[PDB]
Structure 1
Amino acid sequence: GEYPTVSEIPVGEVRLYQIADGVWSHIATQSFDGAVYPSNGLIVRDGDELLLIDTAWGAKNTAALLAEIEKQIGLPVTRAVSTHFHDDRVGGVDVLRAAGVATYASPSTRRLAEVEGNEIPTHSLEGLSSSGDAVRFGPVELFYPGAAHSTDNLVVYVPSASVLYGGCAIYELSRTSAGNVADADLAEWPTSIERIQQHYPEAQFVIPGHGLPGGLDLLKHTTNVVKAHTNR
């Protein structure tokens, strides 16, 4: 097992995993509701700077993330994008802001984070409010596939590396029942996944919000799990 598993990462530690040239995932863990879960984000080299996708789920993990990036990569994180309003995506935004990172999210994500009492990224990403909308953000494309895991969920594509960061709209294969669906749109989630398939059919690596990467098979896997949950 080369990809770090929830079992191998102690409290408040962060692993990096090089997926491709100038693309890493970051992996952290927290206790939640009596179980330990892993959580993924992304790091994309942006010349001699780094673009961060998502916090490492809380302030302590996010401080450890910045220290791991300095140790293993040693280039400054200048911008971060949060892919939805939940604490595994925005928890630690204030740590990033204090370290001089420009934090970004859609106005949808910023609105929902403020309602929830979660940390609010400073900068707004325009042009992502309609299903199927894509915008460039330096070395990535940001895509709003429609409501799925959350109404605001974004996916991130790294064209140089054919890496699709699905975030929490995409489940790892080992997840065969629904995760947190309190904020989900079950009715639209499969339609939103099909938009991802149609936009990024060339993707070679697919990174879920939680757990092990795979290929585009994770999209069909997630549709299967969401449909089974719908039919509960």
Structure 2
Amino acid sequence: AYPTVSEIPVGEVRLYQIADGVWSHIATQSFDGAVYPSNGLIVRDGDELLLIDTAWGAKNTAALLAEIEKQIGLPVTRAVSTHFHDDRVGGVDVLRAAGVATYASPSTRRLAEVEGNEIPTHSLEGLSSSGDAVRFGPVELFYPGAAHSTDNLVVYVPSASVLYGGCAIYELSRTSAGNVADADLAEWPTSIERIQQHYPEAQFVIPGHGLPGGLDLLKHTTNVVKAHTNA
């Protein structure tokens, strides 16, 4: 049932409904020779939608907003980018131009500016230290510590017990480290432990790229990360 990378042409966006008012969005993009799927989240808050991460690029994010109008019919009023790389902020400008208020932590906004990437407008307060969590409309934002990047956020949707890991959580099919130039490999297993200790009742865990699972994706990610570190 969950759409897979070979099912989504670059430029099209799938929505997958996880629970009442909780969707993931799935798109695909070419990077360094290969085509990757990429996940974010849509969470209904009454008559508005919160968006978690772009669809990775201006074209995909415009297709995202178009799919939301067709399939859901509620406006996206706020977006959160979970770290500073292009599959999370790429398309912020399309969101801004459509009227979406775009958010990220101060660190993410600074890392995005330094790297040349699109920059969310608004700063998220309360997320500076590992273990910090804040409610943001219908979701909980959690800063687990440095992992895939130093700034990466994870997101929990209480109504549905959905944990979105972003690029800090790998899918089961991913058995090698996914480009770790900006990662903190010594801290990543500890940051994952913080996630486990905070959301032990998670039912549905979504990696940044690929198929959702359970909390077994956290242990898998630690294994992949430690395996890369020892050799």
Same fold (TM over 0.5): yes
Which string of whole-angstrom CA distances, capped at 9 and with x for unpartnered residues, describes residues 34-92 of structure 1? 11100000000011100000000000000000000001000000000000000000000
Shift of 1:171: 0.1
**2: CA distance, partners of 1:130 / 1:54:** 21
Secondary structure (helix, strand or coil) at the match of 1:79 reads strand
Unaligned runs of 5+ in 1: none
**1: CA distance, partners of 2:24 / 2:68:** 11
Secondary structure (helix, strand or coil) at the match of 1:185 reads coil
Residue 59, structure 1, aligned to residue 64, structure 2? no
**2: CA distance, partners of 1:27 / 1:188:** 28
Which string of whole-angstrom CA distances, capped at 9 and with x for unpartnered residues, describes residues 141-191 of structure 1? 000000000000000000010000000000000000001211000000000
**1: CA distance, partners of 2:179 / 2:210:** 14
State the superposition RMSD in angstroms. 0.4
Residue 191, structure 1, aligned to residue 190, structure 2? yes
Residue 103, structure 1, aligned to residue 96, structure 2? no
Identical aligned residues as a percent: 100
Shift of 1:209: 0.3
Shift of 1:21: 1.0
Shift of 1:31: 1.0
**1: CA distance, partners of 2:25 / 2:3:** 10
Unaligned runs of 5+ in 2: none
**2: CA distance, partners of 1:46 / 1:102:** 15
**2: CA distance, partners of 1:78 / 1:93:** 13
> How is 1:68-87 mapped onto 2 (pairs within 5 angstroms)?
68-87=67-86
**Stretches (4+) displaced over 4 A:** none
Residue 161, structure 1, aligned to residue 148, structure 2? no
Secondary structure (helix, strand or coil) at the match of 1:157 reads strand
For normalisation by structure 1, the TM-score amounts to: 0.99
**2: CA distance, partners of 1:163 / 1:224:** 22
For normalisation by structure 2, the TM-score amounts to: 0.99
**1: CA distance, partners of 2:29 / 2:140:** 29
Secondary structure (helix, strand or coil) at the match of 1:31 reads strand
Q: How many residues align?
A: 230
**1: CA distance, partners of 2:196 / 2:46:** 29
